[PDB]
Amino acid sequence: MKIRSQVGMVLNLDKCIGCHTCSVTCKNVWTSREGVEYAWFNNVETKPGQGFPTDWENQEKYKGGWIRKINGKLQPRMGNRAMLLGKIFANPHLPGIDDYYEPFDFDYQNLHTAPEGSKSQPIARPRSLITGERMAKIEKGPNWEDDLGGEFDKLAKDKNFDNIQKAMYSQFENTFMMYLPRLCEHCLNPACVATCPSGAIYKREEDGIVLIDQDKCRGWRMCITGCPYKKIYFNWKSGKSEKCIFCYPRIEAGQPTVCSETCVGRIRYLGVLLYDADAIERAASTENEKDLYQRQLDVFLDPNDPKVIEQAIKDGIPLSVIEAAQQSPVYKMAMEWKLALPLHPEYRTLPMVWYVPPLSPIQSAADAGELGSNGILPDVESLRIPVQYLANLLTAGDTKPVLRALKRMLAMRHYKRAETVDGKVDTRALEEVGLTEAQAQEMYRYLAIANYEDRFVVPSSHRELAREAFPEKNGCGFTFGDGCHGSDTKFNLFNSRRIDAIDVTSKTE
Amino acid sequence: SKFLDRFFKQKGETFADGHGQLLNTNRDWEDGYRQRWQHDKIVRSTHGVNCTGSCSWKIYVKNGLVTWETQQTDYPRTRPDLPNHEPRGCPSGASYSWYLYSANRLKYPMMRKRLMKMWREAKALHSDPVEAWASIIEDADKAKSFKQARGRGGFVRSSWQEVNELIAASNVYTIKNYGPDRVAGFSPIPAMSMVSYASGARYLSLIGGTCLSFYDWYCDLPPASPQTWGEQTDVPESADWYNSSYIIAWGSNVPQTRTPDAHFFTEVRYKGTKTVAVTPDYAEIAKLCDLWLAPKQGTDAAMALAMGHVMLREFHLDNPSQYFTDYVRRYTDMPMLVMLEERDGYYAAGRMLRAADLVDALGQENNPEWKTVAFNTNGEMVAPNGSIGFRWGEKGKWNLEQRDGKTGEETELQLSLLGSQDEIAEVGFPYFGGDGTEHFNKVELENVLLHKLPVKRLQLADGSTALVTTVYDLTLANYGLERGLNDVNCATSYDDVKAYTPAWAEQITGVSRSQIIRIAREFADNADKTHGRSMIIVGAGLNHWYHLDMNYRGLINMLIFCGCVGQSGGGWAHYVGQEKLRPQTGWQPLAFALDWQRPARHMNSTSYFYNHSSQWRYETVTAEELLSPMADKSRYTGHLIDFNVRAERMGWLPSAPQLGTNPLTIAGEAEKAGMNPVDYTVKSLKEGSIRFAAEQPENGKNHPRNLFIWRSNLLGSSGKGHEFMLKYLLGTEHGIQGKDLGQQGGVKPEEVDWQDNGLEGKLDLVVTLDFRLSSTCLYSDIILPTATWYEKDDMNTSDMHPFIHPLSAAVDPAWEAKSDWEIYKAIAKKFSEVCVGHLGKETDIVTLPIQHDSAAELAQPLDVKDWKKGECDLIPGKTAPHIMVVERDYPATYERFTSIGPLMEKIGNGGKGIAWNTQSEMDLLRKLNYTKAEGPAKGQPMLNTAIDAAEMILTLAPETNGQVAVKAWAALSEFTGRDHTHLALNKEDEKIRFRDIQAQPRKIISSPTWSGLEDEHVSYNAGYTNVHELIPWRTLSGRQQLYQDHQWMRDFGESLLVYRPPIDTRSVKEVIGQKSNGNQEKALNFLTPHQKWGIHSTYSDNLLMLTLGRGGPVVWLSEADAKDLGIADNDWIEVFNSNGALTARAVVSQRVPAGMTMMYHAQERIVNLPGSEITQQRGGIHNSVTRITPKPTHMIGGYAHLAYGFNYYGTVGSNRDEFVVVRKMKNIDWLDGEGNDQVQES
Amino acid sequence: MQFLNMFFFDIYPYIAGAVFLIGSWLRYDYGQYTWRAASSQMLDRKGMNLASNLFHIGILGIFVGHFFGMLTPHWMYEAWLPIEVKQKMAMFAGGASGVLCLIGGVLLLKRRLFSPRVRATTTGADILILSLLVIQCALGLLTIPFSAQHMDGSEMMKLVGWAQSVVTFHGGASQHLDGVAFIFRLHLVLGMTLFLLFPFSRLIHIWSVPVEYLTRKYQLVRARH
């Protein structure tokens, strides 16, 4: 029993409008450098589809995540320590630049410098950002399948269509599309960390953000295969890997991440979650993969339980963090309302970025239809997005928790309409799904009204604990190059001292 | 030493039974990302693009440069029961930062090399620049040498000194020798950047140049609105969607085109609201709804009619709804009496009965011919309050109080005459559901459906007699409702295939009849249960069809029948362009120099380009084929452009150029003729010694010569009939594929001169201001580097929310860029000196069409009279346009531009038919902007910076100054006789300042300029004031107009709505197969909904947007159509027709229904486009295949709600009816001499 | 000749060794961000699997051989592995490695110079270091036929005499080389040169061979620091 905290994220897919604003803001701030211009820490994919990189969900091809051996022990699908080491000269599974797309630019200056007397109007053609050579044609991009862009037989290769008879969905009337925005999961049992030979990847203790140390990374590029979500991108120029850093510079002072604060749809929720680090392996090694979801929920702790509060304190959790945890929207959607589900729990990484499945128009029927248990509003059975599809995505193929979330969402709707249109109290739908009036009203507060202060409840990472904030306040930022940053030993070959430190020791004790 | 650090100690406790290890090692490296996030400061700014977004952003400056942006989240929060707006934003918005130092930034003023060479050589022989310009423009080979260089490279770096002089010189020459109205400017949607638009508009107004329109030109103007409410466009705010319990997104892709507001839609669902999407394809909007209906594109009006049918049947006839009944009784023209005309064996609906028609004139001395009549429940006839006749000439009766216009007593209008008729008459109704192309299903009945209407005979004041009936009765018949008279053309069941039944529409639309019935029922039931909280969000999906009015009136009737308009949570939510510049009357005087001279030269752009880019010379549509079957065909002969010319001379629509003679010389000639200028012009117009320029657009003096383009990409976006603009306006190579009227030997117009070889290259000088080298720039003569939205001050408002916020300079404009405001200020300055000796204190004769909201709107009450045809005298301001006298002080242009004129104090300020005193505001402005020390404008407030201008707008507008807001409501109270000041009394002290909005966006003040309220308990909902304050809709009847009784409306078969199939542009059958490349060609409907990776063409060159999209111009096709054509996903394809051709790559998809193709709006002509195999030129753009085709009903003027107004009414640029030929390309030649060409096999 | 002899085998070896060590230390302390393997695999997977494995498996074979061959003293099992036995091994075991190595390296160089994406993103040092290694490998294999003329391990004894004198800092190391075949001199010079260029090339990845990983706990967590 060792309690740790992390700011989790829940995305309400039902509200996602597939706008990509989240992707653009992340790109502008973090990955506009040459080397990672093709990398999209945050990317949005339209489903059905194979995504970015192409078919990242196919673990038989890419070898991401873990596997539970027959002896019950966990091993990365990539192979054990030696197997992995024996693949280091050339990672046999490494996705190629082409699996993403070849980053391109256009020759705009040709519109400006086109010489006088040109036979045809000048134009700007594409050029490779990798070779600088002229590109005959752009044949791929990071969001190439946006809004069902491509033949159905192509998009349906989607790994999430397994065990589903998909023929019916190629018919115009049964068409359906949804959006899947994604970033790094910042897992409790990250495969990347387990697959990095040099140990450059780590999970921060105070907030669970997983980073790739840019000093220590050696560019062994195995972590990339290791991540089953393929959210680690190789910086082809620096030779090191980079990934979503959960905007730690902001989180550290209590701010939302950029993709969270900039989400036009107001679908992202940030809240603390307390977990028992000592239960991680036990939970991720459970025999049946349809249990990882529930096993993870069991790894999460109740913030209002004095037993947990006292243990958190004893274990070093700041008081403000415990408080933030007690009013965490992420906990309300994952633990109480059971609306949020993990992304591909079967990878056994214990993902910390969850999703609320989306609703969708009713399916095509013989006639205008009839009033179901929810009147004019939809019943869960009438939704056109095949629930089995959603289950392959969020619950390892188990449709029970998906239906439960969808049903409850519709229940809330049914109750609110009774209240606002009929001006009556009708809890028929709520009781059917096991929700109380109070729970429904609260669900409505967070999901519908979604005040800024309710979507983001981020505590400080308290950069002052166990460190020396005073000399840091006074000297950080003066980057003259003192050469003493990054090590604990004071001795340095250039005979220098830290600019943001006190080297004249007090002699008064 | 990191090396020494490698030397057990850093190992803490393990966890999870040895599965994990806690390390106590250095983390200093984390500073690496921290220092990237850190910045110098954040500045508040927004985007000056036409998106209706109006989102406030945080501009981050780091290392003294703009590096990125994130949304501001500090908007004043909405009520506790409503979700807030933060963070708003969209993808394009998030990528603007890219422009600032991108490879496509315009840094210096540029000039076509060929033009510069002749300029510098001409200046060496002519010390005076005006005469230097003359030496080049009056030479045929010189003029031609640079006009044919347009779009063909050769831009060289110039300087502000050089271009400012050439521009000024050219303007002077053009004004002096041809007329001020031969100089024009095009800039759209001022709400997105009020002062930036004002810059050019102000300079142009002062010098008399024409200011072209945009709302109608872009087809955002829904003519149906002016028709029904007498309002350009007023809609509820997005927040109000959250007060609705039933919403239908009809032809509106909310999540993609209203991104920053979508959440109100996804969230209101959790409140119990049901949502329904109506789109032919599986659009993004569908993903968010509970039901998806997919009618065949263009057939939507059919569905609406059917739904209206069910509603009337079920909630008006069978089980009448109290709420709906009272609602249509008091707020529509339904109880209004219509006179019946005698046909052959049957009657036809004529104009509406007027007080004047009755003997004692119902006691109406004032404007009796402009007041509608109805029957009260006691059988008595009466002229009810609110008719447009009570608006002018009298006071206190222009309201919706159900009272008798004579006695002033409380009456009750009766709806149907059924039950008190003197006999049953048979009235014929036009039916077009049987016509149409092969691409849309049709249903045969009769061109004229006869219905049995209950009537009453009246004894008219002129002795004769006539039959009458109510709009109501007429409406139920048009809808096919059986009322007991046993009408063979009325429905017997919803399955009966008759005039607008669910079964009928099922055939036209393809939407299951039961679906139509179910949703019609739910919608109406909801509206009944909530008192109008049903709403329809509609957009370009319907409004860009030639028959947009029918599509719209269909939706409008549904809402009116269910009493949804004017109620929070209900109504007509039209969202297209960002046309709601809230501080209207504070901005108008600034943008059109109305503080100095009145009036300015406004022009409706569709007619302007139709005429000058000569798109009429290729017209395939005839007015005759749009005529009602019950109209006298011989009374409407002529080319569609002939109706425009007549409309102009009758004072209905504006003109540009106005006259065939320099309007600055007319005064000197009246002086010699011994008569004043006005009278002398009317005498010449009657004599024909002076003619309207429209009559001879190619004689060499009636075509614009100088054009300014800014905040617009006219020649790569909005420009319908692109190839025609390149040929007739620019004089460069073009890709037009068809022959003109002359070549086909068709009938020439009867109002416009004809000449086989059309005049080309009419534009002498095209000047474009922009921050990126757009398609328009590429085809200009002079490019002026302007400041990005992150480098200047300005303001922005939108229809979506009530906040007014600013654009601010994060840093000074980079390189040699300047804000639009400073560019025009400098030009006006050089103009003021260059003009000395050529222009002084001139006298200008300006024509001004009859204005809506002015007393003159009451022009021709009963019919149409063409003075040129001798049907009446030429009376300016009534049967022709006003002929105004305007004095211009050309040398003082700059001083006037940089100061607020004396007219605000002398005459006052106002708008929308009301005026108030604005002296106190001017005194405040003298203290805030300081005053001119000397010169012509001595003592007047200053306008040096964009900020002074912004402050001018804020201080003068009632929306941003409570003081003015009260004087404004006071003014309107004189008309209605009801107090409206209470709407703003509790905010009278309120005064919005520019610097305050930089600190935090501010909510505006309820103003008479609009019909919604800015309140803390009720959201902003259009028409709320009419319904709750009893203020009339500026329509003939004062109520919402279901019946249009204008001669033209009646004869073009649109007195009542009716189904109209998409028109045939006949642009395919003449070129299909004429240039085979070996691949199969097929005809498909060409739709251009607005894109996801940009806003129009802006952002289309933005690498971020291009990388998230498909890397350049693309076109969507159904899988079936692509497979038939042998087209694979991403193959190079060519789309073309009579108007031109374009090249692009295909996106094959299942969500695209067979029969249609979509090239998401504006991807323009500068990125990734190969040569055409059809024109042998650079591939064209989406508007290379479209062509303007005006509609007569949109030219109607001098008739109450149907009277002109800048962006209020006028012809529109529809384009969804268009068809194209599609095919896989073969040879992919880039025409760049790179030798990097390809060939697509099979 | 005698001058160039003492320089290259008495002096130079110590210059290259000082630059190798202090250069590695200095670049480790002040160039952590530059301390990477610089993989280019993603940009062009074609042929990398075969070529890289061929090169690395071979080059490592040689290294084990060179290491134990010249740095292991004689009195250490001189009865069970006398000088000529070591030579037999180095010629067949090492020669086979060297063949695998040369093929891999040649394929890698062909790719680095002619694969558009790799060539466009390469640095000069990457071409220079890889070219010198291919050459050093060919040279190495070319010494096989020369060592075959002295199957008694007389040649190998001289080279091992030199190497061992150099690393124990015993002056006169070049004497041990008296009369050895020229091809061996070139191999030694170009080889030590690789050590000199080591700290300023991608070779620094060698220092980071991840042995620790074999015994490391899977999950890592860093405390507040």
Ligand SMILES: Nc1nc2c(c(=O)[nH]1)N[C@@H](/C(S)=C(/S)[C@H](O)COP(=O)(O)OP(=O)(O)OC[C@H]1O[C@@H](n3cnc4c(=O)[nH]c(N)nc43)[C@H](O)[C@@H]1O)C=N2
């Ligand atoms: N991202 C982005 N946002 C913008 C703009 C932009 O360029 N980009 N521009 C502004 C401006 S200026 C306008 S005029 C509007 O956005 C137009 O959007 P709207 O959704 O009304 O039109 P659109 O023409 O796209 O049509 C919407 C959808 O309706 C479907 N549709 C098309 N034709 C029909 C039809 O005949 N009937 C029906 N029922 N539906 C039809 C279609 O799915 C389309 O996407 C607005 N904001």
Ligand code: SF4
């Ligand atoms: S910003 Fe929000 S709504 Fe838009 S795509 Fe990203 S997650 Fe979805």
Ligand code: SF4
């Ligand atoms: S472009 Fe318009 S909608 Fe997009 S962020 Fe800017 S203002 Fe908002």
Ligand code: F3S
């Ligand atoms: S495997 Fe480790 S060495 Fe770097 S490239 Fe991945 S974090």
Ligand SMILES: [Mo+6]
């Ligand atoms: Mo528009």
